[model samples]
Target: ATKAVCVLKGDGPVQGIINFEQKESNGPVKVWGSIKGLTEGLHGFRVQEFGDNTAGCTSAGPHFNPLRHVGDLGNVTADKDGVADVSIEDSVISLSGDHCIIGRTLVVHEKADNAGSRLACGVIGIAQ
Candidate 1:
């Protein structure tokens, strides 16, 4: 199996660790993570094409997929304590293949709206 992780950091207090794993090439990727320091509501979560964050999350480019955007994992809802626990399986994203997610960016937006401002972002890298 292949594994990867993303340690999210932003200009604000948002921070988190996201993990990704795939048992085979072109297979579904298992995703899980915990994010803190967010409002008590839903936030937009997605994978961007570029891993660059030198100019903040704005430089992460567009969503990883052009059509339907495989990286569009939808919203992550935070609890009253401002923490969101994520666990989902994505079939479109891959860990090893032409559409590998490694070297990309996992971004968290301030609200459920994809057009909203970004709150945090992390680069997806090999874990083991």
Candidate 2:
């Protein structure tokens, strides 16, 4: 399988890793990831449009919704111990093609969909 990944980064205790997997070159992408040190609830997750994070998540711009496909692609649920895992099959995102998600930023927030209250974020990286 062909895959891509994003390393979550931030100053808070919240952290995680995200992965995008595809079975074929043009097939739909499958997204998965795990997070820790959260606030024990649902969190809004997204692939920010910009790759630049020089301002520590303030520079990631907005969600990567080029086609505006049914809101955000990732919304994770954290357990009691502040850990969460997600496996989502998404057609709105791509790992290869004109809509490829490489070089984007992934973010997890303290509150769902609150960009200003971001907890952690990282740049999407190549899977080794």
Candidate 3:
């Protein structure tokens, strides 16, 4: 239970979290370890959507890259699927580390995110 959570509006009509990740967890849409620890710089984060109606899965977008840094979570961090962190062996991730992810907005999409780059996007944060 030592991690952070980021979420976006789910496919549900009502305002809901499309998915979320903990600094650590077994199965949650956004795997925890998937996220790299946040610093004073920008860290781009992304999720993968495909096959099923990941569209309805909703939430899709860039991560807390406040630094305006130029770097998409390509194969370097994320894979072609846009899975920017670890392999999806289990539903849970090991979370990168110490960061703030509260108050951010979660946007639900009507399609699946390939996790390649910034296709559909959402906002999540602990700042105004």
Candidate 4:
């Protein structure tokens, strides 16, 4: 497989934007991915909810911790209660934190995220 897409579909779809270029971060919100997509093997990614500073800024929920190391997104079809740790071929990873400048809103639909909790919530690369 090659190039897994994470489409953010939120109520503010037209107002919010998604980013996938995080190489460094602090805690509770670590992310990593290639804007050019993964070459091979399993790739990981995330869709954080950076709502507006007033009422939208909802904080990408949690540092997308699938191992239950942190808060997770809830879903029914998910194998577990978190985001997918690995993409089929390639994917994008985005999260909340000062590193981002956009608002809360994302929709990873190209593929079905089955992390259990978040219908498609995964885990943080955690500098592994």
Candidate 1 deviates by what RMSD? 1.4
- Residues 4-41 of candidate 2 have per-residue lDDT tens digits of 88878788788888888887777888888898988888
Given candidate 2, what's the lDDT at residue 66? 74
Runs in model 4 with CA error above 4 Å?
Answer: 1-25, 28-45, 48-77, 80-98, 112-128
TM-score of 1: 0.93
* lDDT measured at residue 107 in model 2 versus the true structure, 0 to 100: 84
Report the lDDT tens digits of candidate 1 across residue range 16-103.
9999999787888899989999999999999999999889888999888844467888888899999999999888888876678899
The candidate with the higher TM-score, 2 or 4, is: 2
User: Would you give me the overall lDDT of model 3?
Assistant: 0.31
User: Considering every candidate listed, which one attains the maximal lDDT?
Assistant: 1
Q: Please give the lDDT score for candidate 4.
A: 0.28
By lDDT, highest first, what's the ranking? 1, 2, 3, 4
Cα error of candidate 1 at position 59, Å:
1.2
lDDT score for residue 116 of model 3: 26
What are the C-alpha RMSDs, in order, of all predicted structures?
1.4, 2.1, 12.6, 14.7
- Tens digits of per-residue lDDT, candidate 4, 1-128, equal 11122333233221112223333343232222222221222222334543322322233554433332222222112122222332121122223343332333332332323422222222122222
TM-score of the candidate numbered 3? 0.25
* Span of ten consecutive residues with least summed lDDT in model 3: 67-76
lDDT of each: 0.89, 0.79, 0.31, 0.28
Clash numbers, per candidate: 0, 1, 27, 31
| By TM-score: ranked, best first | 1, 2, 3, 4
